[PDB]
Symmetry: D2
Subunit: 227 residues, 4 copies
């Protein structure tokens, strides 16, 4: 019941962690907009969640797709309260200098430009919500690789460092507008793998009124791997 | 299931943040051991909570008081699953060089030795539980002063730096024993004060099975103050 | 004479910090390749240093300009031992949501893609030098805003977070190849403004053999701003 | 000659990193006060440097020893410009719960109380130098284990977290008095002689060079930092 009444828009929500978060948010009483590049993925997750979910196929590196995604969410649910920037792509592990410009550009398009587009497009609506006293949350999913890289994912890890840094910058700027901005760093000392439902719980907590005084942070959820 | 069935020993539980946590944990179905140098404070808080709370007067800077506290917790509740190192004393803000050795040594004795004593005394018990499948949590309450100091609390802030650092060291070492070790840093951009309520919610999340993959972290709860 | 016999390529070296480092490096006996989008400014700085300097006009957001710059460096001086990524652009301070895509993308082109392009194009050469027993250094100029943003520079500050993160990732990956990768964060409790020569000295230190055991760090040079 | 005319007091200077720093600072023109609990060690290092060096026997965990140490430095050299907090003790690697209170107390006494004593007793003099236009520096030697611990050194590492945190707290408070406070994080606890991404081990001279840079006018706008010198170990 923690998120009852709230509307969350979640990117990369057709699979893995994004799907886990959307299912968990919906179980908490939230309406969920399932945004993914994979249309079959988005539709399947929407189906499994049920009436609380809207499926939206989009390539968030593209301005037009973001605009369409946002319009569809607003049209279906009347407002957005929570944005989870979760979509991300990598490169296969390799020597940094072997990643070529096309691949590098694609990675930046989703992991950097996508976050920029999705966020800047929803900020005016969030500010409007905050003026009527309805607090909003932007949650960015980054990675332990942002601040604790191992070799061979240089360009991917750097986009995640961008995400953590943008989280702090937006948080200090948007706080007085009643918009919180947080991040999660998913990855092992605890001796088991991270499952989508683990990350989902941290996300539901951070996006709930139980975390109303928490903004600008990057929470590691990683079994102690970043230590 | 979250805190139902758990036993939490909380230091400095006779007022402020410590009291807030004890009441929040008890509401979650936990048993709580109310540890404070202030006997009347511990008894007041324990009576405000009722049958699920046990009062224990103790000066955690003293080894024999810690032992008696651990012994009374186990005598009463059979086990301890959660330790909250919350007890802390500071100095009146002042030029660093004006804090005299006697007062300095007192601050260290509670904020540093008290943590060492209460934690090292519960670890063998925590390892036994963890080995039997009952995961345990150590929660340390530090301060945003540890990493983001402002003038005139130098020696107080440094003991909080000690707390953040020991959280990390204990977490990496105890993770294989299935004991998590985490920290909170209570403090304003969000435009309002932090209440014991707020910090208690974060403590309840981090000490729950909903945080089973979170260890080694220090989470700021500060309305953005430290950005 | 600490940098005697070394060749440094410095981007954005036609003015400001970049120029200060170029002159300081040359005073330490290095040959310097002055790279800047502003041809007349690259020429000015090169002319002021003398025979030890080569002016090179380049838009580092374009692969063709990068390849040409690296070729010209190698053609003139036979090798490059030090790369300083210092070229950066930003936006007028303003609300984040008011920075439009064309401007957002241009900032990324210089601050993100330009560093990736210049760095990846030099790594094979740095690896060759490393195998011949010659230590190479990549110095990334980021900003205090990366980790301590103030409102209104969100997307700019984010690119600087990308740079600090890429410093760590490349440092871990390339250490075995005898290539150090370090960052500086220029900015005030010390009560005065930061001058080019202040940063220049930190740079000359980090790029010299006196720092041969320092890699993966981001050094704040900020009179205490980041504390 | 970057430190010519400056006076540096260095703790744990009887061996290892501290002895390395002391010789390096003296080569740069500084007078050096060699403070160590091991009296014979202090006297050896002072004798190896010459007239620029003064040996001082002190257990810096003790206020009385610290008072005598400071008085001796001022009476010999007339002033102190640089303080290096380098002395440190640890415990043998073991399960954290096995370190007993008496050992724990000893570690806090040197690594924590010792830094508090030496620094708080020099601050009023450092503020006088500051007011006269003479910049001072406090350099604290911490460790990569403060922010990046590995198992078995919990209580040692935590004292080094305290060092890093106090460096930040004192830096912000003391900056307007013209006193910088900085820290070094090197990866045996005092660097004494007879895996690493960079492919060799840290030597006292590596650490000494970083310290010499941080304590010089070439670093006049650097304060509040904790600089890792670890060959990439902490990344």
């Amino acid at each position: 019941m923690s998120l009852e009444g709230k509307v969350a828009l979640i990117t990369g929500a057709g699979s893995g962690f994004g799907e886990g978060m959307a299912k968990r948010f919906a179980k908490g009483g939230a309406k969920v907009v399932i945004v993914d590049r994979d249309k079959a993925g988005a539709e399947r997750v929407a189906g499994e969640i049920g009436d609380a979910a809207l499926a939206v196929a989009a390539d968030i590196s593209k301005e037009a797709d973001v605009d369409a995604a946002v319009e569809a969410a607003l049209s279906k649910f009347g407002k957005v309260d929570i944005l989870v920037n979760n979509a991300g792509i990598g490169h296969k592990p390799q020597n940094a200098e072997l990643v070529e410009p096309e691949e590098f550009d694609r990675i930046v398009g989703v992991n950097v430009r996508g976050v920029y587009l999705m966020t800047s497009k929803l900020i005016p609506h969030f500010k409007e919500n905050g003026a009527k006293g309805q607090e909003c949350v932007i949650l960015n999913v980054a990675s332990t690789g942002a601040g604790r890289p191992r070799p061979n994912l240089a360009w991917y890890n750097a986009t995640k460092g961008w995400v953590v840094s943008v989280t702090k910058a937006l948080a200090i700027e948007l706080a007085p507008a009643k918009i919180r901005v947080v991040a999660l760093n998913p990855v092992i000392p605890m001796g088991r793998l991270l499952k989508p439902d683990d990350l989902a719980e941290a996300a539901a907590f951070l996006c709930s009124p139980q975390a109303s005084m928490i903004t600008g942070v990057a929470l590691d959820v990683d079994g102690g791997r970043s230590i």
